[PDB]
């Protein structure tokens, strides 16, 4: 059923039909272009007039171009053949290696599973990072969030969990990149050929990739995250494997819908977002779940705008996350890397019936001596360090060794540092922190714990500093 | 009286409650508000009124007209929108402190911040 | 004598450091209250102007 | 008659044919169980008015039938309204039968003219020693009552009702502006158990107007007008000296800025209405002293976010003439009533209003109560005996003065067992004129705790030991 | 290049001693003057005379205070800020530097309050 274009303002194109009206959330093909331009229906306006949003640019559009209809939403190709390929929002391959040849096509708009299709079991997934496994443990099949501002390490910490977790994992893996720099989608395609995860010669790859970056029109940065978790829904449902899912960034799903909003005819809410902010967020975040047919681990990076966690876009994602890892610029400007805030990160399995009673009284023993270190800094600013008593000159020196011991040299940050990549196991992280608290290392300076692995290297680094006096 | 050779004196009390009455008629006409939800032409309201208080020359009769408006500030705020639109019109100030009125000095005139520019040359040589 | 001379001047010099820190704490309370009202006023105009032009 | 065209929330639009009613009238919807009164607020053209509802709006069909009273909301008024409870439209809400009276009055009424005002200030005496000496009450003025729950506020309400009906002979009205149902039930039963309201005869001393909190935002703004019509009957028709209690005044302001935003108007500064200075003007100018009688008002004031320069507690402050503050730090000291003597101010405290005898007595009391406030810190930090012998009497006298401000009330005769004392004005000035001069200093402290005049003080020193 | 290498060097020393005084006002207001160093009781004691030496009695303001209007040349406002930044006048109070013209009247005022 053909239709004409009657208005173009920005990225919002109005299309008047005559005899057959397509429903909301469909695909319309603009005839007359050399490229493929797909329009997605968003509203009805009466007298057979819809109002659409454009997936590509709108330059060179004229009033009267005949527009076809599909009868179905954006059906991307899906299957086992899409592994090791980069694809577009509408399913075209942009790796320039040929057509994706598969048998299953699947729409990106689908429902959420019901209440009696949820799973209830909890586990612990070990990573190897000392701050994460001690104070805020992650979980298999659980949604994980990476907060923090701009330029603190959200892309590197999400590059670390592809390094550790994704090669030791059995099943497949999906990376959706939404609204980030087009350079950094090339340092992933060239750090996954030389590690053999993407293979360009046969059929043994384990990673798919979906990319819509920050050069796209704002109608195309808000349907890419729905295209990421459509491929990752095929593996969980039509197959049975354990899937991972990495999403960076996800603040650019909310922001890209706050730009097409005022031309669709909506009054703005608080500080500038759309009125339907917490409904379409909660419509995407209810498909990333662990059901009774599979399990989806999911790590997500969440940009916090100008270091304010009370902004309405990051402060409504908290209801959808089990483990939050709040990064901070006040730690990163000390040199403590990864800058994870210990007094602001939580988990749902910090529970002495799940992690055992020995891990539990160590975690709260670390936060209690760090929070009591905070209230002591208010005295040193007026009194000084030396005028304190000898009893709280010790709880400072125990706290400063706990701050520095949490910082671990990462593997993918070798070109920044030159240091080597360490991976401390779970049983050693607890035993390292019992001995600083009990007082078994009061004879070492603070520098012996900076950027080390296990506690064994904390004394080997202590003697090597001594001899150069 | 000014145009017919006589001298007058007028005390507006107060010009603060006039500007909250012009604000009401403006926003009820759907006009764009500005600082402190005021309309854009509050300066036209008080300048076109306090420009009339003048002294004619001897060829026009020789009368005069003196004005003494009153502004109320909220907790010593002499840096707000309305008490700066009227400092930048009138030829001086008289300041009344609320923390010298409590100490028993009455009238609580701040002698440090009270100035009168043009009226210093016209006083009695005995004074 | 010197530990009495010192311990009395610690009493006075910690007293004027709480008068000057309470004199400073009222002047920042007025500026906090002017600025708290000015942000509710400012972001109210942006919603009204956004709806009127629509 | 008219017809309803549009129903949007708590705003109904009514289409008439011939008899277009003016603004501030009152319509009434036909076909419903309970009375639903609409108040006309705007003429929208083509014979259509814009009305704000006063109860629930659901169940209303487009195209119903609506009558017209031809007048504003008219309430049952009279002397037989004493001791009953009514809402904003005059209906009784305590299931004690319909109120029967002779005449009615309209709530939207103009101010008194300029040639009817009083030309002189005049002090209202209420009997309490701390009120009528340091922060006295002008006749006709507006009073602000600082303090909330747990300080002993609802006793001070119930006692100023009792004393004016004894020394002056004027009844009172209580207007609950958007008040809680749980706390508007306890005040009903606390007045029953103290005598000021009475279920058996016609010796009641108050009339209750309760517009409660779960009512539409148009019905919480007119309650302070309905509760001012009744207070105008006992001045214009009988010439009494009436009191008036509003609790509180912030829920009258805040309920105004939700009608002016449901009606589609651009808000002023921080969120209030454009008309914040006339709604406080076209209410509180009817509270005045005419040539027949007077109306005096005691109002509770809640300050939002501890900001004294917010426009809701700044519009109100230009109308008040005296403020009394209930400090909780005097309630843990044992003194009742818990009125702070240093942080209460009066505008009529002036040698050319109350005379020089009241002035130099009440001036010296607040000066001596400051010297004990400055000398109590040296005694707490350093010690006691280092200060002079001329200062030991000021420590002793100021503990006599701040216990001589206590007074047993007539509303508490059953509980604390003492006798309620009502002190006239000439005893309270005579009393404190002698405590300052060291005339009754050799008597101990507990002779002054909880007495009436200065005569009963020396009759209590004999009973000790 | 344009104003010279001697004008440019005295004018940047004045903006250096007035910025370091601005970073100590958060401490002098709380802990007083007796908590500074000994070399930082000289940045304060010199910036409180350069501040008063940037005052000048104008010519049109003769009818305000009754003081004479003073005018200085450009070559003499370079010499006034060298004999303060070096330490030539560390035996005069701050109020002797108040509302004068060139540097010669500052020493002709400190002899009055003797
Ligand atoms: N392992 C690390 N620890 C601490 N900082 C890092 C690490 N890796 C990178 N950074 C710092 O983080 C900054 C931003 O890195 P990146 O994660 O790519 O950006 P963003 O988090 O803003 O997406 C870089 O300037 C780099 O110095
Ligand atoms: Mg990034």
Asked if residue A403 lies in contact with residue A175, where contact means CB atoms within 8 angstroms, the answer is: no
Decide if B37 touches C, using CB distance below 8 A.
yes
Q: Is A249 left (phi over 0), alpha (psi -120 to 50) or beta?
A: beta
| Structure tokens given for A270 | 């608080």
Structure tokens at D377: 């810190």
DSSP code of residue D109: -
**Which tokens sit at D229?**
């019509």
SS3 call for C45: helix
Helix or strand run (H / E) with residue D402: helix D389-404
- What does each C-alpha distance from D54 to D6, D38, D65, D182, D213 come to in angstroms? 16, 6, 17, 22, 13
The protein residue with its alpha carbon nearest to ligand 1, atom 23, reads: A155
Question: How many helices (DSSP H) and strands (DSSP E) are in chain A?
Answer: 13, 16
- Burial of B61-80, coded b for 16+ CB within 10 Å and e otherwise, reads eebbbebebebebbeeeeee
Residues 6+ apart with CB under 8 A from D219: D54, D55, D87, D88, D211
Q: Which ligand approaches the C-alpha of residue A409 most closely?
A: 1
Query: Given an 8 Å threshold on Cβ–Cβ distance, is E34 in contact with C13?
Result: yes
Catalytic residue among B35, B106, B117, B125: B117
Among C30, C38, C45, select the one facing B75 at the smallest CB separation: C30
**Could you tell me if A65 and A86 are in contact, meaning their C-beta atoms sit under 8 angstroms apart?**
no
Flag if A267 and C50 touch (Cβ within 8 Å).
Answer: yes
* CA distances from residue A73 to A99, D122, D298, D450 in whole angstroms, order as listed: 21, 82, 68, 84
Of B37, B75, B77, which is closest to C41 when you measure between CB atoms? B37
φ, ψ of residue D258 in degrees (nearest 5): -115, -15
Any atom of ligand 1 within 6 Å of the Cβ of A412: no
Nearest to D26 by CA among D106, D102, D119: D106
Q: Establish whether residue A303 lines the binding site of ligand 1, counting it when its CB lies within 6 angstroms of any ligand atom.
A: no
Residues of E whose CB is below 8 A from B121: 63
Cβ distance A267 to C54 less than 8 Å, yes or no, reads yes
DSSP-derived 3-state class of residue A469: coil
- Rounded to the nearest angstrom, the distance between the alpha carbon of E93 and the centre of ligand 2 is 59
For residue C42, the domain's CATH number is: 1.10.287.80
Does the annotation place D179 within a ligand binding site? yes
Nearest CA residue ID for atom 20, ligand 1? A151
Q: Is A366 exposed, middle or buried (0-12, 13-18, 19+ CB in 10 A)?
A: buried
How was this model experimentally determined? Answer: cryo-EM
CB atoms within 10 A of CB A34: 6
Ligand 1 contact, A252 CB (< 6 A):
no
| Contact: B32, C49; criterion CB under 8 Å | yes
CA A460 to CA A448: how far, in whole Å? 8
Longest Cα separation, chain C: 81
Ligand 1 within 6 A of CB of A409: no
Which subunits count as partners of chain D given 3+ CB pairs below 8 Å? B, C
Contact B37 C52 (CB under 8 A): no
Q: Which of D311, D260, D254, D255 is nearest to B36 (CA)?
A: D311
- Whether ligand 1 lies within 6 angstroms of the CB of A416 is answered as yes
Instruction: Please report the DSSP string for chain B in residue order.
Output: -TTTT-EEEE--S-SHHHHHHHHHHHHTTTPPP-GGG--TTHHHHHHHHHTS-----GGGT--EEEE------SSS--SSSHHHHTTTTSSB---B-TTTTTTT-SS-B-TTT--BSGGGSSS-S--
How far apart (Å, rounded) are the C-alpha atoms in residues A367 and A355? Answer: 17
Q: Which residues contact D173 (CB under 8 A, 6 or more apart)?
A: D206, D207, D209, D227, D228, D230, D231, D242, D243, D244, D245
Give the neighbours of chain C: at least 3 Cβ pairs within 8 Å: A, B, D, E
Rounded Cα distance, E49 and E92, in Å = 10
Shortest distance between the Cα of C38 and any Cα of chain E, in A, equals 27
Nearest CA to ligand 1 atom 24: A151
Determine whether the shortest distance from the Cβ of A334 to ligand 1 is under 6 A. Answer: no
Distance of CA B58 to the CA centre of its chain: 27
DSSP strands (E only) in A25-112: 27-30, 38-44, 49-54, 67-69, 75-78, 86-87, 104-107
Find the A273 Cα to ligand 2 centroid distance in Å: 22
Ligand 1 centre distance from Cα of residue A105 (Å): 38
- Rg, Å, chain D Cα set: 26
With CA atoms as reference, report the closest residue to D372 among D387, D362, D358, D360.
Answer: D387
Distance (Å, whole) CA D88 – CA D217: 12
Q: How many CB atoms lie within 10 A of CB A51?
A: 18
A180 is catalytic: yes
| CB distance A108 to A256 below 8 Å | no
- Per CB-CB distance under 8 Å, the chain A contacts of C49 are none
Q: Which atom of ligand 1 is nearest to the CA of A159?
A: 17
Q: What are phi and psi of D167, to 5 degrees?
A: -85, -20
Contact B37 C45 (CB under 8 A): yes
**Distance from CA of residue A28 to its chain's centroid?**
31
Q: Which of A271, D258, C43 is nearest to B33 (CA)?
A: C43
| Catalytic residue numbers of D, as ranges | 153, 179-180
Residue of C nearest to D261 (CA): C48
Ligand 1: atom nearest CA of A150 is 22
Q: Dihedral through CA D17, CA D20, CA D26, CA D30, nearest 10?
A: -10
For residue B73, list chain C residues with Cβ-Cβ distance below 8 A. none
Q: Which of B30, B33, B77 sits opposite C45 (nearest CB)?
A: B33
Q: Does residue B14 have a cis peptide bond before it, meaning omega lies within 30 degrees of 0?
A: yes
> Alpha-carbon distance A409 to A454, whole Å?
11
Crossing angle for the helix pair D153-167 and D183-192, nearest 10 degrees? 40
Interface contact flag, B75 D309, Cβ < 8 Å: yes
Q: How many helices (H) and strands (E) does chain D have?
A: 11, 18
Q: What is the whole-number distance in angstroms between the Cα of residue A158 and the centre of ligand 2?
A: 9
A119: how many CB neighbours lie within 10 A of its CB? 13
3-state secondary structure at position D91: coil
Would you call C49 an interface residue with chain B, using a CB distance cutoff of 8 Å?
A: yes
Query: Do E32 and C17 lie within an 8 Å CB cutoff?
Result: yes
Query: What number of other Cβ atoms are within 10 A of residue A151's Cβ?
Result: 9
Element (H, E) at D2: strand D2-8
Ligand 1 pocket, residue A415 CB under 6 Å: no
In a mutagenesis test of the C interface, which of A272, A381, A384 is the best target, namely the one with the most C β-carbons within 10 Å?
A272
Locate the DSSP E strands across A302-446: 323-325
Task: Looking at the CA of A153, name the nearest ligand.
Answer: 1
Give how far C37 is from chain D: nearest CA, Å: 6
Looking at ligand 1, which residue's alpha carbon is closest to its atom 22? A151
Q: Cα–Cα distances in Å, from A337 out to A329, A407, E24? A: 11, 5, 33
Contact D269 C37 (CB under 8 A): yes
Catalogue all structural domains in chain E, each as residue range(s) with its CATH number: 1-114 (1.10.1140.10)
Q: Range of C29's domain?
A: 14-54
Chain D touched by B24 (CB under 8 Å): yes
Q: Is A153 marked as binding a ligand?
A: yes
Residue A432 structure tokens: 């390292």
Q: By the CB < 8 Å criterion, does C12 face chain B?
A: no
């Amino acid at each position: 059923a053909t239709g004409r274009i009657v208005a173009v303002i920005g990225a919002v194109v109005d299309v008047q039909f005559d005899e057959g009206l397509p429903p909301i959330l469909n695909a319309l093909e603009v005839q007359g272009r050399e490229t493929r331009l797909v329009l997605e229906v968003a509203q009805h306006l009466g007298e057979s007039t819809v109002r659409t949003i454009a997936m590509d640019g709108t330059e060179g559009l004229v009033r009267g171009q005949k527009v076809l209809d599909s009868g179905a939403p954006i059906k991307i190709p899906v299957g086992p053949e899409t592994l090791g390929r980069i694809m577009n929002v509408i399913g075209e391959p942009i790796d320039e290696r040929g057509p994706i040849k598969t048998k299953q096509f699947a729409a990106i708009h689908a429902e959420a599973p019901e209440f009696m299709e949820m799973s209830v079991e909890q586990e612990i997934l070990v990573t190897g990072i000392k701050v994460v496994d001690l104070l805020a443990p992650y979980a298999k099949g659980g949604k994980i969030g990476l907060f923090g501002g701009a330029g603190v390490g959200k892309t590197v910490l999400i590059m670390e969990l592809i390094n550790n977790v994704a090669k030791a994992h059995g099943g497949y893996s999906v990376f959706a990149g939404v609204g980030e720099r087009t350079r950094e989608g090339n340092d992933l395609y060239h750090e996954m050929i030389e590690s053999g995860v993407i293979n360009l010669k046969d059929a043994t790859s384990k990673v798919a990739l979906v990319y819509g970056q920050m050069n796209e029109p704002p109608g195309a940065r808000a349907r890419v995250a729905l295209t990421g978790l459509t491929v990752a829904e095929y593996f969980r449902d039509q197959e049975g494997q354990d899937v991972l899912l990495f999403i960076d960034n996800i603040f650019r799903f909310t922001q890209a819908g706050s730009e097409v909003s005022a031309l669709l005819g909506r009054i703005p809410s608080a500080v500038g977002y759309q009125p339907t902010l917490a409904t379409d967020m909660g419509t995407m975040q209810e498909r990333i779940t662990t059901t009774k047919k599979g399990s989806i681990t999911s790590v997500q990076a969440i940009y916090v705008p100008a270091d304010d966690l009370t902004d309405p876009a990051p402060a409504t994602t908290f209801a959808h996350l089990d483990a939050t890892t709040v990064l901070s610029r006040a730690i990163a400007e000390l040199g403590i890397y990864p800058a994870v805030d210990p007094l602001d990160s939580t988990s749902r399995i910090m529970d002495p019936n799940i992690v055992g009673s020995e891990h539990y009284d160590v975690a709260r023993g670390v936060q209690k001596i760090l929070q009591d270190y905070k209230s002591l800094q208010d005295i040193i600013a007026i009194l000084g360090m030396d005028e304190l008593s000898e009893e709280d000159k010790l709880t400072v020196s125990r706290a400063r060794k706990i701050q520095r011991f949490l910082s671990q040299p990462f593997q993918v940050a070798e070109v920044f540092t030159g240091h080597l990549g360490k991976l401390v196991p779970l049983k050693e992280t607890i035993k390292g922190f019992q001995q600083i608290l009990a007082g078994e290392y009061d004879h070492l300076p603070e520098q012996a714990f900076y950027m080390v692995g296990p506690i064994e290297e904390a004394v080997a680094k202590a003697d090597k500093l001594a001899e150069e006096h | 009286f000014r145009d017919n050779g006589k001298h007058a004196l007028i005390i507006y009390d107060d010009l603060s409650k006039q500007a909250v009455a012009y604000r009401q008629m403006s926003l009820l006409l759907r006009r764009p508000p500005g600082r402190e939800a005021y309309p854009g032409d509050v300066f036209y309201l008080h300048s076109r009124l306090l420009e009339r208080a003048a002294k004619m020359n001897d060829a026009f009769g020789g009368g005069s007209l003196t004005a003494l408006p009153v502004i109320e500030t909220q907790a010593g705020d002499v840096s707000a929108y309305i008490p700066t639109n009227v400092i930048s019109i009138t030829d001086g100030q008289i300041f009344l402190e609320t923390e010298l009125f409590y100490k028993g000095i009455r009238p609580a005139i701040n002698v440090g911040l009270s100035v009168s520019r043009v009226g210093s040359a016209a006083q009695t040589r005995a004074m | 004598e010197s530990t009495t001379s010192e311990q009395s001047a610690r009493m006075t010099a910690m007293d004027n450091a709480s008068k000057n820190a309470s004199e400073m704490i009222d002047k920042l309370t007025l500026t906090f209250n002017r600025t708290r009202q000015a942000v509710i006023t400012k972001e109210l105009i942006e919603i009204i102007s956004g709806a009127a032009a629509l």
